[PDB]
């Protein structure tokens, strides 16, 4: 099957050393973002994360319902979590490169 097939297939994909859990939507590998926040650039407060993301233009989105709980069976996120943002594959390395390496 082709990737676009499934926006509701988790994969995993490497970013920074860590295997961050995604979707493919919309042609794109959209990442778990609290994973990508809360681990990979944990050494980064939210005020400067959001503050790279502003002058980059980083497109965040958040996840459907469906994906959204798949996230918690698949064991990725907490079962009271009420939503989930999804950051590109392209956006997060791009991010990854304006905050660990300036």
Do not use: W
Request: charged share 15%; aromatic share 4%.
């Amino acid at each position: 099957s082709m990737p676009s097939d499934s926006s509701t297939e988790l994969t995993q994909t490497v970013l920074e050393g860590e295997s961050i859990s995604c979707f493919q939507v919309g042609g794109e590998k959209r990442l778990c973002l609290p994973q990508v926040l809360n681990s990979v650039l944990r050494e980064f407060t939210l005020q400067q994360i959001n503050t790279v993301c502003d002058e980059l233009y980083i497109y965040c989105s958040r996840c459907t319902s469906d994906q959204l709980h798949i996230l918690k069976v698949l064991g990725i996120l907490p079962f009271n979590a009420p939503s989930c943002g999804l950051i590109t594959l392209t956006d997060a390395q791009r991010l990854c490169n304006a905050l660990l390496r300036p």
